[PDB]
PDB file of C-alpha atoms in Angstrom:
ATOM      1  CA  UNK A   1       0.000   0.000   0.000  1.00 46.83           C
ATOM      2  CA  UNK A   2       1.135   3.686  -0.242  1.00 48.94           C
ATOM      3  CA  UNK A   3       3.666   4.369   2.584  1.00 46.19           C
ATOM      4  CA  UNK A   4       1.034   7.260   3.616  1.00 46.66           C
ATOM      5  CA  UNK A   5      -1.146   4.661   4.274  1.00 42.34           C
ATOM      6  CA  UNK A   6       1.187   1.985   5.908  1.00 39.17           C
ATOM      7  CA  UNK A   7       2.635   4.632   8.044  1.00 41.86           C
ATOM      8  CA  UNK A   8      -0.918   5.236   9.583  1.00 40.52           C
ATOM      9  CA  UNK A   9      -1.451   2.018  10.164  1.00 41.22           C
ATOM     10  CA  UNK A  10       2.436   1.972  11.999  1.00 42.53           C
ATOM     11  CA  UNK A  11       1.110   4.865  14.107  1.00 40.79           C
ATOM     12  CA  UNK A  12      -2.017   3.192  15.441  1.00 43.50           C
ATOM     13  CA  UNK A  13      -0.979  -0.246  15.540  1.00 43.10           C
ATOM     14  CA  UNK A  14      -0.744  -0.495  19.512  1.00 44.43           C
ATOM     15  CA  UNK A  15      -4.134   1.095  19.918  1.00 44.41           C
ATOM     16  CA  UNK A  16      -5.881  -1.579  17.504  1.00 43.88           C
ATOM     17  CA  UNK A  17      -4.268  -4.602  18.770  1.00 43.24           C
ATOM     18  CA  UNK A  18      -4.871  -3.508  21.955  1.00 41.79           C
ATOM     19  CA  UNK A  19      -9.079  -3.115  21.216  1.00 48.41           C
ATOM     20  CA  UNK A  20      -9.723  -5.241  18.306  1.00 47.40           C
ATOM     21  CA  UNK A  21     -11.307  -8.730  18.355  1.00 44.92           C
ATOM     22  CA  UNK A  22     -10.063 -10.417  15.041  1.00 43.07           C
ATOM     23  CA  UNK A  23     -12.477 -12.952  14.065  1.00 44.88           C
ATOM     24  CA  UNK A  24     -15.370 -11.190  12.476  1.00 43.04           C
ATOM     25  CA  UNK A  25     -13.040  -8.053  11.103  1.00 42.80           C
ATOM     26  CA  UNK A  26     -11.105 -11.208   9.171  1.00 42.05           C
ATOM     27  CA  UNK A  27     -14.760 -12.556   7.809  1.00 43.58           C
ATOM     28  CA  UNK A  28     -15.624  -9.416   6.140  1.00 42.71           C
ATOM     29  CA  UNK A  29     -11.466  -9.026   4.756  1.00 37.68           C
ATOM     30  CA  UNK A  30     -12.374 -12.959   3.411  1.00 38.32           C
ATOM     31  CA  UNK A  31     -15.265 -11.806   2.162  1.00 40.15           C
ATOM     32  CA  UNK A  32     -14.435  -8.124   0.249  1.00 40.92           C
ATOM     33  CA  UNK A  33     -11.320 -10.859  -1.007  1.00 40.34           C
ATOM     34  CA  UNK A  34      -8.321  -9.207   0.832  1.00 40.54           C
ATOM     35  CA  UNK A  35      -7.619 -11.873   3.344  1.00 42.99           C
ATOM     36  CA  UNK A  36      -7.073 -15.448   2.424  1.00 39.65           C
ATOM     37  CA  UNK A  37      -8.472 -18.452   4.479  1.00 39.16           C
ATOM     38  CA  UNK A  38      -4.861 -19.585   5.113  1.00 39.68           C
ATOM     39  CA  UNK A  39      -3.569 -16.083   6.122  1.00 36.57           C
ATOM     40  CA  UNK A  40      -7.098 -16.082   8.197  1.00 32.31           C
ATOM     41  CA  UNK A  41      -5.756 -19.522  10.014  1.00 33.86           C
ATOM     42  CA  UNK A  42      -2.397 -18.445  10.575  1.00 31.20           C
ATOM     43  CA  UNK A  43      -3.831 -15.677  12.886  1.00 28.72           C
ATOM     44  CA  UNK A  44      -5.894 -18.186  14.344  1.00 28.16           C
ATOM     45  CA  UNK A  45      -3.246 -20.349  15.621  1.00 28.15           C
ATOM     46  CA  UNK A  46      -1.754 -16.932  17.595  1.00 27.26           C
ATOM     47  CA  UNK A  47      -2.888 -17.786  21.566  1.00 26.49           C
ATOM     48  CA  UNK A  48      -4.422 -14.600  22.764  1.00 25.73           C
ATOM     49  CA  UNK A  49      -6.661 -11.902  21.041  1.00 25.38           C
ATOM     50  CA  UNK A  50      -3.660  -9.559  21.192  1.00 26.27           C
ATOM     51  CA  UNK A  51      -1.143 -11.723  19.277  1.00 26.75           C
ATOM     52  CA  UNK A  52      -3.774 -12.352  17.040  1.00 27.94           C
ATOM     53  CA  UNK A  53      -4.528  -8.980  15.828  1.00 25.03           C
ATOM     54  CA  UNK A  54      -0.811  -8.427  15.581  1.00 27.46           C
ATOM     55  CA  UNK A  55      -0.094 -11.027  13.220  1.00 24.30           C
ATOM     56  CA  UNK A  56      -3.123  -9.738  11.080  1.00 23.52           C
ATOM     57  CA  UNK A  57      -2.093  -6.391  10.998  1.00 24.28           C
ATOM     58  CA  UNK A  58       1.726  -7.537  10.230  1.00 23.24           C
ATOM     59  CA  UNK A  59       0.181  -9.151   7.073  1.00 21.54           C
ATOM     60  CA  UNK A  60      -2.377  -5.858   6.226  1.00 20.54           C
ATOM     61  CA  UNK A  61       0.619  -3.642   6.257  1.00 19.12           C
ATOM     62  CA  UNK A  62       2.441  -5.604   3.300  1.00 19.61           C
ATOM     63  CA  UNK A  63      -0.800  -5.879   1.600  1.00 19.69           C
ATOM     64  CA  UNK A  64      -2.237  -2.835  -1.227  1.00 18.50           C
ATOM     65  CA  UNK A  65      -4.835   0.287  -0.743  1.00 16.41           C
ATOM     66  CA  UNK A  66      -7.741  -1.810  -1.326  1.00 15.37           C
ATOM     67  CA  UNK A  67      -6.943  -4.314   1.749  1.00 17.48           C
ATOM     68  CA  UNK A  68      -6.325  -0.850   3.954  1.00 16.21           C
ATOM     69  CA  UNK A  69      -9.519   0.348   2.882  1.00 13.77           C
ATOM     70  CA  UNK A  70     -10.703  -3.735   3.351  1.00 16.23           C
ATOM     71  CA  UNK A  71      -9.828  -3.554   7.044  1.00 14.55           C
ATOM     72  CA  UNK A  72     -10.640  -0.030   7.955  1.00 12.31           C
ATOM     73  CA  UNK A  73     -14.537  -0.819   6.382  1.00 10.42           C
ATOM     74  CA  UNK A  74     -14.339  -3.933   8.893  1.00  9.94           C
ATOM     75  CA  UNK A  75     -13.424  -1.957  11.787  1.00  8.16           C
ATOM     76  CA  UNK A  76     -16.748   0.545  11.240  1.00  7.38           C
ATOM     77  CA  UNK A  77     -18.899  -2.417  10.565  1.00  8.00           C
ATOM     78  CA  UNK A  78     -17.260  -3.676  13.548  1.00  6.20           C
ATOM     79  CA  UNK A  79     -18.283  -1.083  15.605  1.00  9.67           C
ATOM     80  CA  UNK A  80     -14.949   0.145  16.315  1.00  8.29           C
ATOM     81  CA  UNK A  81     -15.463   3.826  15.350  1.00 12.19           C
ATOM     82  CA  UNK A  82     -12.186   5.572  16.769  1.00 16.29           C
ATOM     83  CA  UNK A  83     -10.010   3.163  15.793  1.00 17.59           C
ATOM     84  CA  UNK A  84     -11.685   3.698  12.137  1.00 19.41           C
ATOM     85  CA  UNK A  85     -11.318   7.212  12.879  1.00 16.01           C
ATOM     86  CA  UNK A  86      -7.826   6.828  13.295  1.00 18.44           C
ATOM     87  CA  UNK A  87      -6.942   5.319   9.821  1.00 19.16           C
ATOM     88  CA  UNK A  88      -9.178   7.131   8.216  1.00 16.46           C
ATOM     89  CA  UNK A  89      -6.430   9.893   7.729  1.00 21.83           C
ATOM     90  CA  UNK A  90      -4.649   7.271   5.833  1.00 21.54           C
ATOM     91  CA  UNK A  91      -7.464   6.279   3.627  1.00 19.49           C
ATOM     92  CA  UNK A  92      -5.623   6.789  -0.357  1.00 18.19           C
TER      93      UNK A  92
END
């Protein structure tokens, strides 16, 4: 993705593995078709909530715009509006 947008992403990386569950965020990514079911399982197979959302975002910020924009849609239909908020001045 553009470094604008991976740098965002750098910058608020504590405060969404902190919050975020991963499981239904990584059904909508599966679904829009920027996650993969194996990619999906990998974070899976992380122990806590926590480790999981930071090997999901470790793969989101090697992936392109359309997977930022993937994830930060997740996050509002998530219900996680600040964290959305705070990507959203990333947003290509």
């Amino acid at each position: 993705m553009d470094a604008k947008a991976r740098n965002c992403l750098l910058q608020h990386r504590e405060a969404l593995e902190k919050d975020i569950k991963t499981s239904y965020i990584m059904d909508h990514m599966i679904s829009d078709g920027f996650l993969t079911i194996s990619e999906e399982e990998k974070v899976r197979n992380e122990p806590t909530q926590q480790q999981r959302a930071a090997m999901l975002i470790k793969m989101i910020l090697k992936k392109d715009n359309d997977s930022y924009v993937s994830f930060y849609n997740a996050l509002l239909h998530e219900g996680y509006k600040d964290l959305a908020a705070l990507l959203h001045d990333g947003i290509p």
